[PDB]
Design a protein around this ligand. Structure first.
Ligand SMILES: COc1cc(CNC(=O)Cc2cn(CCNc3c4ccccc4nc4cc(Cl)ccc34)nn2)ccc1O
Ligand SMILES: COc1cc(CNC(=O)Cc2cn(CCNc3c4ccccc4nc4cc(Cl)ccc34)nn2)ccc1O
Ligand SMILES: *[C@@H]1O[C@H](CO)[C@@H](O)[C@H](O)[C@H]1NC(C)=O
Ligand SMILES: *[C@@H]1O[C@H](CO)[C@@H](O)[C@H](O)[C@H]1NC(C)=O
Ligand SMILES: *[C@@H]1O[C@H](CO)[C@@H](O)[C@H](O)[C@H]1NC(C)=O
Ligand SMILES: *[C@@H]1O[C@H](CO)[C@@H](O)[C@H](O)[C@H]1NC(C)=O
Ligand SMILES: *[C@@H]1O[C@H](CO)[C@@H](O)[C@H](O)[C@H]1NC(C)=O
Ligand SMILES: *[C@@H]1O[C@H](CO)[C@@H](O)[C@H](O)[C@H]1NC(C)=O
Ligand SMILES: [Cl-]
Ligand SMILES: [Cl-]
Ligand SMILES: [Cl-]
Ligand SMILES: [Cl-]
Ligand SMILES: [Cl-]
Lengths: 532, 530
């Protein structure tokens, strides 16, 4: 039976799903861990105990408990990122799309969703794996992991709330794929992990973490890298935020045990309602409960691991979007609105700079301002708007990724870098937001192939070449088919630093992605902030 | 009669000189101070005592004692700035060119030479006042002042070597003009002082100093301003350099009196031979003996005077050249040569910014480097060279002047700002040096009007335009003649300036505003913080 699969934890029964006038098999909502509920809240995950009978894997699972965005009620542009299933702490499930007929031993791709480590679901429409699995003949897995305080409350020293347990959730799903994907026609020796934003940082963190390295072959990182300023905190700061969470909930704070015991008695929504109150500053692109540099999942500082070559040496493919910052300014900074051009006054520019670089002293804010201000034309609201957009995306996404790219390439086995800069013809968000954080995902997952969604024919072709780059890289470590007639995406090298644009035009090769601003963010500003 | 003038100090006899197929009167080498020689070395100047008989004013005077540039022997481009008369400590003289026939009561312009406060002569070819006096019908005076240690050795608290005596030489010549120019056909109520480089800084210093302000009407500043980083030192640093000069010469250092007595025994060239040894850093565009912020000539810090409005409120006309830095790199920085395009390696670029900003810490040098480096093309030797050129000129001339112009305009009565960016067609220096520090002077003084010097016809028209702007401003406080395109007032809000070149005038705003925010606001804050 094509839909009946016996795994090491028991039998599962999938469902036959239509795709683009054909069909493939889907195994939805397979458990990979014990429910992390009750006295297991904040604890490392435990493997799912084997079950008798047949697991009905015909429907999507629950989503993990998380903040729900109600900024634009009814608006598809925001609501499509919210949970579309019931939320529950019982949420550690994965989904598998398998070509039909079942392949013998084919390439596997495992998707890790983003969402700032505080939101995200495996079940969103834009993460539907059926188009990529069918078009490129890959076995596509999407995992899940605890987000927010449930996944990343860190009281270092405690074994009840150690921190990083959402990362351990991801690892346990990777271990399940390693142990079971052969029963679905996948090769556990050819697993590519890919993810976007926090999922892209996560992918980088598994490259670094010794306990993860042997559970995958190579990696794709989209608009995120492990060294991003929002993607981790120190053990001291994670302790600070966890204690502040208890303080917001009238918890006994005398010891880790009773603080944890207090927090385990609260309903999930009680923690979520105060989650944002524990941040140290008014800020944008900052999130309360994130991975912690603990000495276990990460043996030393990320920078020292990067400098020494202490990471998995393989092939990577990674990149960024042109306007990573716009969504964060819309939600968090003065003068921005989705129903206007959002021309930014000089006063609102100054406010946004402080929100964008909250850890900076006054000298550091001056440096950022001078670097991004045209003093011949300082009251230009369009230049002010775009300058802030660039500040947010450069500081938080692009320049951290370029730092990772350059350190990794010194030891890795092949780097391919992209710059996604296509604005979708059917975008529901205003034109000033440009090429938004997250809006390459629908191209990676082949949604433009669905004629009902009203993408252009050029956008379908773009989606198809991106899916084929991604999958060919997954299968071989090279996005290019050698001996093909197509334009070749060149290796990124330390010396020449090449990358391509991804858009609907013929390929352009460039060098030194945003090198000028990234010298500022990666070398000058940190030296300034460390001055005294 | 026309050439025989009785002044308050005695009779002077000038000479009839040819100018452009005509003639005017020249009175050369008139003394305005007692010779500051012997025990008067380093002291404030004293008025020249009256003489009987007729002072022969037919010949240029001696030049003050100074370092002589021998980098390019026989090269006219460097030797034209060196002394062209015998050097002597007996050098406090001035020169006057008077239209013929003698006007009744006309506008006076007084030239103050530059040269880093360590060199300069009133007698150079490019300062010949006859073309400007004749063409614009003004009385043209050039003064002189002691340079180097002789003018600016500063041992504050001593009255024997107090500092700033070179500035007091300038003021005494202005006092002499105030008292006597009426006998030469000049109006002492309509005196414009103007100078370039250190002379431009000097002009600004006389605007600030209460003891100078009543001795002139208006001012012109060319490629220099009083707040320039090279233009003054603190009394502590001045004292340190004076003590180090004595140390270099095996002087007794126990007391001011003993040090000064030692330094007064040395021959002039003995002091000049060690002058540069007292600088605290390897550097370019830094000079050993310069004005001191003493509490007397300058009542408080320059910045506080500028902020409070404690200065002379009048009209000013001022500006800069496109490539102020190139001359200093040629003489002082690795990789530059007069005989090549001087493409600058990355290594020599780093050495250059260190020499250019000697007071900066490592973080400050990084900031300057980031501000001027194209990291898409960092091994471009042309971009590295031009970046270093901009650094030197922006830091040392352009941005200090813009800080001055913005502060002055808040209280003053009229500001006119120019940007001189014409490369002379007969320039003797290589192309990479561009529009060099000092090379607007020949246009201000009308040398393009001289056929044998082989300027183009367009360059003669430019010089005539510049001479008329300068003199009309001197006469009225406004460079424009009330009838025709206008040079607009620089205002705090609109910040307009004009280019000066052979092309029709264009108005711009915010001269090098991006780099001057860096030099005037961010870098000072960075260095004060780190
Ligand atoms: C600043 O401090 C505080 C902050 C808050 C509240 N902040 C906020 O909600 C910011 C926010 C976060 N998301 C997450 C929604 N999904 C996503 C995306 C998810 C994953 C990956 C890419 C995504 N790309 C999106 C692009 C657009 Cl265009 C819209 C939504 C996107 N939506 N908005 C409350 C209180 C505070 O004190
Ligand atoms: C910090 O200490 C140091 C500082 C420096 C940096 N100062 C120096 O270059 C000064 C200098 C002066 N002359 C001889 C002066 N004639 C002049 C000028 C005179 C007055 C006004 C403008 C002049 N425009 C000239 C242009 C050219 Cl092209 C050639 C000579 C010019 N030659 N050099 C170098 C080394 C150091 O150690
Ligand atoms: C599995 O669940 C699906 C979805 O409701 C249902 O249609 C199907 O009958 C179930 N299979 C069983 C009960 O064997
Ligand atoms: C990857 O490693 C193999 C094995 O040593 C080597 O032959 C190849 O050159 C490497 N490729 C890159 C791009 O480093
Ligand atoms: C897609 O375009 C069709 C044809 O114009 C239109 O009827 C439909 O409403 C569009 N669908 C969406 C989801 O925009
Ligand atoms: C003034 O000096 C010049 C040369 O030094 C001389 O020719 C002239 O006759 C002198 N005038 C006198 C001595 O009256
Ligand atoms: C100069 O001062 C006069 C007299 O007070 C005044 O009328 C005029 O506005 C001033 N001009 C400028 C440019 O400030
Ligand atoms: C000026 O031009 C004349 C005439 O062509 C020429 O003889 C002379 O050499 C030139 N002078 C200089 C100083 O170049
Ligand atoms: Cl479909
Ligand atoms: Cl390489
Ligand atoms: Cl002549
Ligand atoms: Cl040039
Ligand atoms: Cl004004």
């Amino acid at each position: 039976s094509e839909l009946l699969v016996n795994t090491k934890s028991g039998k599962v029964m999938g469902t036959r799903v239509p795709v683009l006038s054909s069909h493939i098999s889907a195994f939805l909502g397979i458990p990979f861990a014990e429910p992390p509920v009750g006295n297991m809240r904040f604890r490392r995950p435990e493997p799912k105990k084997p079950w008798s009978g047949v697991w009905n894997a015909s429907t999507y699972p629950n989503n993990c408990q998380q903040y729900v965005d109600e900024q634009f009620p009814g608006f598809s542009g925001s609501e499509m990122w919210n949970p579309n299933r019931e939320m529950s702490e019982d949420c550690l499930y994965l989904n598998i799309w398998v070509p039909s007929p079942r392949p013998k031993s084919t390439t596997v791709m495992v998707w890790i969703y983003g969402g700032g480590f505080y939101s995200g679901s495996s079940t969103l429409d834009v993460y539907n794996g059926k188009y990529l699995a069918y078009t490129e003949e890959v076995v596509l897995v999407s995992l899940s992991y605890r987000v927010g305080a449930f996944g990343f409350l860190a009281l270092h020293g405690s074994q009840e709330a150690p921190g990083n347990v959402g990362l351990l959730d991801q690892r346990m799903a990777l271990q399940w794929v390693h142990d079971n994907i052969q029963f679905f026609g996948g090769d556990p020796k050819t697993v590519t992990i890919f993810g976007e934003s926090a999922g892209g940082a996560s992918v980088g963190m598994h490259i670094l973490s010794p306990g993860s390295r042997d559970l995958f072959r190579r990696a794709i990182l989209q608009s995120g890298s492990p060294n991003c300023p929002w993607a981790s905190v120190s053990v001291a700061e994670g302790r600070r935020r966890a204690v502040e969470l208890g303080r917001n909930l009238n918890c006994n704070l005398n010891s880790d045990e009773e603080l944890i015991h207090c927090l385990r008695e609260k309903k999930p929504q009680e923690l979520i309602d105060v989650e944002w109150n524990v941040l140290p500053f008014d800020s944008i692109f900052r999130f309360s409960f994130v991975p912690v540099i603990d000495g276990e999942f990460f043996p030393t500082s990320l920078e020292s691991m990067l400098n020494s070559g202490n990471f998995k040496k393989t092939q990577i493919l990674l990149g960024v979007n042109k306007d990573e910052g716009s969504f964060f300014l819309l939600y968090g900074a003065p003068g921005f609105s989705k129903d206007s051009e959002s021309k930014i006054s000089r006063e609102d520019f100054m406010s946004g700079v402080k929100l964008s670089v909250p850890h900076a002293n006054d000298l550091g804010l001056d440096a950022v301002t001078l670097q991004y201000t045209d003093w011949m034309d300082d009251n230009n609201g369009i230049k002010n708007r775009d300058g802030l957009d660039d500040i947010v995306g450069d500081h938080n996404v692009i320049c951290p990724l370029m730092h990772f790219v350059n350190k990794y390439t010194k030891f890795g086995n092949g780097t391919y870098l992209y710059f996604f800069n296509h604005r979708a013809s059917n975008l529901v968000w205003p034109e000033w937001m440009g090429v938004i954080h997250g809006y390459e995902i629908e191209f990676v997952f082949g949604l433009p192939l669905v004629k009902e969604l009203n993408y252009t024919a050029e956008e379908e072709a773009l989606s198809r070449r991106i899916m084929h780059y991604w999958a060919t890289f997954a299968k071989t470590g090279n996005p290019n088919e050698p001996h093909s007639q197509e334009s070749k995406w060149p290796l990124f090298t330390t010396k020449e630093q090449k990358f391509i644009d991804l858009n609907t035009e013929p390929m352009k090769v460039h060098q030194r992605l945003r090198v000028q601003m990234c010298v500022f963010w990666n070398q000058f500003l940190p030296k300034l902030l460390n001055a005294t």
